[PDB]
Amino acid sequence: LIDSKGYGVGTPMGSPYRDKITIAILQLQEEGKLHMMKEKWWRGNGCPEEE
Amino acid sequence: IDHKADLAVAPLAITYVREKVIDFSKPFMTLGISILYRKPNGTNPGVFSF
Amino acid sequence: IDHKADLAVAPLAITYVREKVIDFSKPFMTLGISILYRKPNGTNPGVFSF
Numbered sequence A: 001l002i003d004s005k006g007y008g009v010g011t012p013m014g015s016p017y018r019d020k021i022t023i024a025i026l027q028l029q030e031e032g033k034l035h036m037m038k039e040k041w042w043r044g045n046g047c048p049e050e051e
Numbered sequence B, C: 001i002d003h004k005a006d007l008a009v010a011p012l013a014i015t016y017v018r019e020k021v022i023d024f025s026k027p028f029m030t031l032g033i034s035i036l037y038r039k040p041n042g043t044n045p046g047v048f049s050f
């Protein structure tokens, strides 16, 4: 990884949802659901047999 | 910045220049710059192999 | 939670419970579980293997 960047959600100033969404993100992250759904939506074909 | 939306979920940089003007939360994922390439066929010049 | 000060600039995992009771800055060093293992036993010499 040459560089490091992060996708985060945008909102104007003073939004009450900043913190309520941070906690939600942390819990869902600990749920690993993000991981599996990332796998699914980034799955595609898979590797064929090539040996 | 004019509130013409609400919480925006989309590929969106976390940048200083944007954080100065818009508010962000804990990243749900992390990016990266990495190379892209096609795996070699395996063939090599007739001089090097022997 | 008390007020000795505002800061603790240390490796401190931003967990669900910790954000419940602590406001956190944005991450600076992302961390993950990996594994550690030995490279080849590699017990071969060029002196007598011939």
Ligand SMILES: *[C@@H]1O[C@H](CO)[C@@H](O)[C@H](O)[C@H]1NC(C)=O
Residues within 6 Å of the ligand: B039, B040, B041, B042, B043
């Ligand atoms: C692989 O083969 C293609 C033709 O099938 C050729 O154009 C290409 O240069 C080759 N690349 C490598 C890395 O062998």
